[PDB]
Amino acid sequence: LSDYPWFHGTLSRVKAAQLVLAGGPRSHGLFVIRQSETRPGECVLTFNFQGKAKHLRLSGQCHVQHLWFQSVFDMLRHFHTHPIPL
Amino acid sequence: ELSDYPWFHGTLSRVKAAQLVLAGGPRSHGLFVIRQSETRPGECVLTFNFQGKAKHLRLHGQCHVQHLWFQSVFDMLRHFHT
Numbered sequence: 001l002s003d004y005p006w007f008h009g010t011l012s013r014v015k016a017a018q019l020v021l022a023g024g025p026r027s028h029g030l031f032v033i034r035q036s037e038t039r040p041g042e043c044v045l046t047f048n049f050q051g052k053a054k055h056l057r058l059s060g061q062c063h064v065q066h067l068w069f070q071s072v073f074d075m076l077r078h079f080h081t082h083p084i085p086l
Numbered sequence: 087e088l089s090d091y092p093w094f095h096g097t098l099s100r101v102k103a104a105q106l107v108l109a110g111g112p113r114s115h116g117l118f119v120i121r122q123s124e125t126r127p128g129e130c131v132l133t134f135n136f137q138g139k140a141k142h143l144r145l146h147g148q149c150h151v152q153h154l155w156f157q158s159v160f161d162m163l164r165h166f167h168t
Contacts (some may be wrong), residue, residue: 008108015098025124028158028161029159029161029162031155031158040167041095043127043154047154047155047160048158049154049155049157049158050093054151054154054155055132055151056148056151056152056155057146057148061143062143064143065143067136067141068134068136068141068143071116071134071136072159074115074116074166075116075159075162075163075165076162078165078166079162079165080161082165084165
């Protein structure tokens with residue numbers, strides 16, 4: 001879990017929102033997985049949806065779940081390597 | 087709501103969902119579909135293509151936010167598969 005670039009351990013709710021909102025609506029889709037501050041036993045999926053920060057609670061398929069997030073991340077990375085020419 | 091999204095495929099079977107996301111092989115990496123489970127009536131399943139293989143992930147009040155998440159992933163597939 002800690003080996004993935006999209007996992008940000010103890011990152012707070014507030015800081016996670018600021019992180020995914022940097023860039024405003026253009027950062028649509030940007031996300032981070034972090035440990036919940038209020039519910040220690042869980043993780044939270046924080047993402048940018050059209051310029052607004054959303055928080056999705058994530059409470060025997062953890063590996064497959066990681067594969068999914070990794071796939072989504074591969075898409076974000078793609079935007080950050082093969083940007084749309086101006 | 088759910089049924090209004092292009093990535094939701096209602097009754098789609100496990101087998102047909104795998105076939106769908108696997109068309110294109112490794113190149114369809116990331117393609118996914120949300121469908122109703124056929125072994126657990128109340129839930130949905132997230133079926134996606136990971137490097138050429140089909141994966142099935144079993145899926146409060148955060149259903150709407152959940153939809154926004156899947157819609158955002160769907161929005162990035164285009165460029166990604168282009």
